[PDB]
Design a protein around this ligand. Sequence first.
Ligand SMILES: [Mg+2]
Ligand SMILES: [Mg+2]
Ligand SMILES: [Mg+2]
Ligand SMILES: [Mg+2]
Ligand SMILES: [Mg+2]
Ligand SMILES: [Mg+2]
Ligand SMILES: [Mg+2]
Ligand SMILES: [Mg+2]
Ligand SMILES: [Mg+2]
Ligand SMILES: [Mg+2]
Ligand SMILES: [Mg+2]
Ligand SMILES: [Mg+2]
Ligand SMILES: [Mg+2]
Ligand SMILES: [Mg+2]
Ligand SMILES: [Mg+2]
Ligand SMILES: [Mg+2]
Ligand SMILES: [Mg+2]
Ligand SMILES: [Mg+2]
Ligand SMILES: [Mg+2]
Ligand SMILES: [Mg+2]
Ligand SMILES: [Mg+2]
Ligand SMILES: [Mg+2]
Ligand SMILES: [Mg+2]
Ligand SMILES: [Mg+2]
Ligand SMILES: [Mg+2]
Ligand SMILES: [Mg+2]
Ligand SMILES: [Mg+2]
Ligand SMILES: [Mg+2]
Ligand SMILES: [Mg+2]
Ligand SMILES: [Mg+2]
Ligand SMILES: [Mg+2]
Ligand SMILES: [Mg+2]
Ligand SMILES: [Mg+2]
Ligand SMILES: [Mg+2]
Ligand SMILES: [Mg+2]
Ligand SMILES: [Mg+2]
Ligand SMILES: [Mg+2]
Ligand SMILES: [Zn+2]
Lengths: 23, 192, 37, 176, 136, 126, 133
Amino acid sequence: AKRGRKKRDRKHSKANHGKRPNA
Amino acid sequence: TANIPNKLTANVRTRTGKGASRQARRDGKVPAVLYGHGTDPQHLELNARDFAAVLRSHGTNAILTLDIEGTEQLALTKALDVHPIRRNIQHADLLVVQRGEKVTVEVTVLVEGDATPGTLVTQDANTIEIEAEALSIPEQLTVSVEGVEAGTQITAGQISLPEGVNLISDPELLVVNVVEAPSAEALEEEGA
Amino acid sequence: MKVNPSVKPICDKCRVIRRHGRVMVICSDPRHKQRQG
Amino acid sequence: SRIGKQPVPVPSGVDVTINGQNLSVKGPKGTLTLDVAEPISVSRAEDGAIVVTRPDDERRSRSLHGLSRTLIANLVTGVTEGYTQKMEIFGVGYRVQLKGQNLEFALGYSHPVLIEAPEGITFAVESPTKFSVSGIDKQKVGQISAVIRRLRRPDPYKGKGVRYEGEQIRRKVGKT
Amino acid sequence: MLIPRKVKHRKQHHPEQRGIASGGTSVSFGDYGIQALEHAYITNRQIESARIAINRHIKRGGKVWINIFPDRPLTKKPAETRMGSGKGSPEWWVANVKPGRVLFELSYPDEKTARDALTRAIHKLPIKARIVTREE
Amino acid sequence: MAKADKATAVADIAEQFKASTATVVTEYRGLTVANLAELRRALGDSATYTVAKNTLVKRAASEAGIEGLDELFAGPTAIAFVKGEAVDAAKAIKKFAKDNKALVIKGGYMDGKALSVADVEKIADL
Amino acid sequence: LIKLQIQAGQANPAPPVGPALGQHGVNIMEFCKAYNAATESQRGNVIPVEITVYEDRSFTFALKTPPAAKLLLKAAGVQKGSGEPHKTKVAKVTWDQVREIAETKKADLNANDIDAAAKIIAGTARSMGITVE
RNA sequence: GCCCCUAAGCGUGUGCUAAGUGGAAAAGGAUGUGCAGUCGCGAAGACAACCAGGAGGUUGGCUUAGAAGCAGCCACCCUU
RNA sequence: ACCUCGAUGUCGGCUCGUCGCAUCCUGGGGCUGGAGCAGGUCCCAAGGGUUGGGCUGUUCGCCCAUUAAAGCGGCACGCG
Ligand SMILES: [Mg+2]
Ligand SMILES: [Mg+2]
Ligand SMILES: [Mg+2]
Ligand SMILES: [Mg+2]
Ligand SMILES: [Mg+2]
Ligand SMILES: [Mg+2]
Ligand SMILES: [Mg+2]
Ligand SMILES: [Mg+2]
Ligand SMILES: [Mg+2]
Ligand SMILES: [Mg+2]
Ligand SMILES: [Mg+2]
Ligand SMILES: [Mg+2]
Ligand SMILES: [Mg+2]
Ligand SMILES: [Mg+2]
Ligand SMILES: [Mg+2]
Ligand SMILES: [Mg+2]
Ligand SMILES: [Mg+2]
Ligand SMILES: [Mg+2]
Ligand SMILES: [Mg+2]
Ligand SMILES: [Mg+2]
Ligand SMILES: [Mg+2]
Ligand SMILES: [Mg+2]
Ligand SMILES: [Mg+2]
Ligand SMILES: [Mg+2]
Ligand SMILES: [Mg+2]
Ligand SMILES: [Mg+2]
Ligand SMILES: [Mg+2]
Ligand SMILES: [Mg+2]
Ligand SMILES: [Mg+2]
Ligand SMILES: [Mg+2]
Ligand SMILES: [Mg+2]
Ligand SMILES: [Mg+2]
Ligand SMILES: [Mg+2]
Ligand SMILES: [Mg+2]
Ligand SMILES: [Mg+2]
Ligand SMILES: [Mg+2]
Ligand SMILES: [Mg+2]
Ligand SMILES: [Zn+2]
């Protein structure tokens, strides 16, 4: 589940503000 | 047995609210309110550290001498709103009191001494209500256990109550019950 | 020598240290030697 | 801390040399050199001592204080009295002899083994069971002693091998 | 196991698991207790294991109060089945726990043994808890 | 440990000295518990046997003119004391001193005056 | 420096005194001939002892203790007692016979009076789990 | 967002981190380190290291061969 | 039910490989209720090696004779 975790966590960047499409 | 009032400082809360209370609580201060027959609910910030220190030294039930901007008042802790988790005191209630004034209060009861070994002593009511003067309030009173016979109950009416204090609770409120220590084949037989 | 996530002083002759970045418990008893991993 | 707080005695026959943070000690047994840590300070107390002092109580200097103190003490004692280790053998047929300046062990291997004493270290057997290792350096004597000690597996059953002098091996007995 | 004798409705929604425990946050029956710090579903399996753990550790005489009851049923639809065809049949029981609620309470003479039995119980629970004493 | 028992024991030793005339002081380290049993068999029938901290009784040695034994705190002290005539305990100190030769007579305190280790046999025979 | 206790009707048994001495370089039957003199004074008492056998086979045994339950047998005639104390107050021992028995009980003690010895008798009996009367 | 790629700060002041943590994760383990809060003793000399001991009643009574203090029960006794 | 139904050929075997290590053998160890011989368990280690048959469509599996050993897996359950 590395791909899912690592895609899902890049929403927590400063430029995304804790949100991103498809979580 | 007069108890010397404890001397805190307090100052009138400029403006009220949850934001103001949170800020004051953040600066190491406790929001509180004076009331009583002083007929003026007066909103007072007081030092959190000193409040906790005096509550440690003299329990929940202790007279204070509040210095409100120079005016000198006698107060008694009525209630403390405390957080369930962070355990910090959030709010305090202060009845105004003066000498020679009976007041109803709740005093903790701490069982003292060792019991007879074959059985365990267990308290159901840790607090007993008493009527007593402002200065003569006992912060705690003891109940005797010294090698009781087989399991028996104890109620508020047979306690060595202090002088100048009066029981309020109905005398048949159980406080400490000696119950026989569960055997090996009795302890794990309850709970499912 | 155990290699487990949790290391504890099994007996009172054991003692816990940090050696080379690892928490270890070291005793005079060879059986109690034990480190984190 | 407290150990790093007292100065090191220097005897009336042993002369010291300080340059920069480097120093050397010279005595009857030989000579030695040593380097002292950076934040620590080393001073020649002319009243007969070498004072090691930490400027502050930060954990690094708090740590290097006693370290440097013990290094200087070991340097001086090694140059004055030297460092010697007594070490014994146990078992039947486990024997020790000499060959030149080297010391030879016959401990039940199908071949003999023998150790060449490196620089500043002199082996000296006093009995086929008892031998000693001596040197000007405390660390070298201990290291070569440990190297000797581990020429056999530990023996908790019969104890046979190379033990230290004052060492009490642990021993568990198999049921047969 | 702790099972209610009957519930009026046997298929409820999942208990809302937010907020701080408002009711039941004090130690009242015994002198030492285990007091929670995280939201969870404490099933009767966890409760039974923890109670047996405390009883095994103290093993002599002392009162254990399980002042939480598992009376809320979580259902589970049978395996290998697709979505749909209605809600499943209830097959485990739960207490809804908030951060703040005293879960287990103990009365025992000494201190260290009581603390150790309480932490032995804590290890069997799906949450972080702490040992809390009868006094402020 | 607090100042309370410090002071109470200071008073204890000071007051037990007051009513005793036989005062021979000694250093004893190195004799077994059963050996002290033998000594209190042979001496406890007349005396009491105590020890004092080399510091706590520095000021406990000031109420009388017992200021003269502060300078003999070199070696953990201990005293056997008889309340009667001074002549009793001096024999038993030698009786319990000969059997090891490792119990030293730290000195004496006679007529309320402090004396070295040499002059205990000077007065003990007399 | 050791101690032993021997029953008055046993013949060098292996359970109680098997490893009692063999590791200390002590004899057996010669120790029997030594310790029978002191065991057989009373003819009706099992005897304990403080044993001190020197490294070179010179046993120097001296009495230490009297037996406790076995002499309560002779004190009351009671056969034995229930192993669980503090509920059966079915045992009674008096003080005047203690004054009788002190002069054979005070022989090896370290007090300066009789209060201490009479009181340690009382304390031993109270430690058995009963009172003294 | 501002060392170079790559536009703009190897910005200033005070602190923290030694893990390349920053630049993934749980129950749980842990003398890492900084700060704050109380508590026990402590120059009448305490914690460590160093020595003399650690006794008399007295191997307390339980099923067994010995429970003696070190399987498993009953709990917390005097003399120096 | 997210791409593919104006076509992404579907099991096993063959040929040929390639990578991981969660190690089957060989190599280095710590603890043992490890005397030795031989083991048990954990740790480190991926360089090379890792058989031929009977039964069955077989994978799986059962067995036969060996072997230092006859490892487990990913690659469109690799490879038409
Ligand atoms: Mg997963
Ligand atoms: Mg979503
Ligand atoms: Mg474990
Ligand atoms: Mg809702
Ligand atoms: Mg509540
Ligand atoms: Mg409610
Ligand atoms: Mg847990
Ligand atoms: Mg580019
Ligand atoms: Mg640029
Ligand atoms: Mg910037
Ligand atoms: Mg710069
Ligand atoms: Mg910068
Ligand atoms: Mg900076
Ligand atoms: Mg990391
Ligand atoms: Mg990283
Ligand atoms: Mg993490
Ligand atoms: Mg922990
Ligand atoms: Mg920290
Ligand atoms: Mg036993
Ligand atoms: Mg859809
Ligand atoms: Mg498409
Ligand atoms: Mg298609
Ligand atoms: Mg096409
Ligand atoms: Mg095509
Ligand atoms: Mg196409
Ligand atoms: Mg391939
Ligand atoms: Mg590996
Ligand atoms: Mg491998
Ligand atoms: Mg191997
Ligand atoms: Mg191995
Ligand atoms: Mg290579
Ligand atoms: Mg076929
Ligand atoms: Mg493959
Ligand atoms: Mg395929
Ligand atoms: Mg494949
Ligand atoms: Mg194909
Ligand atoms: Mg084809
Ligand atoms: Zn250990």
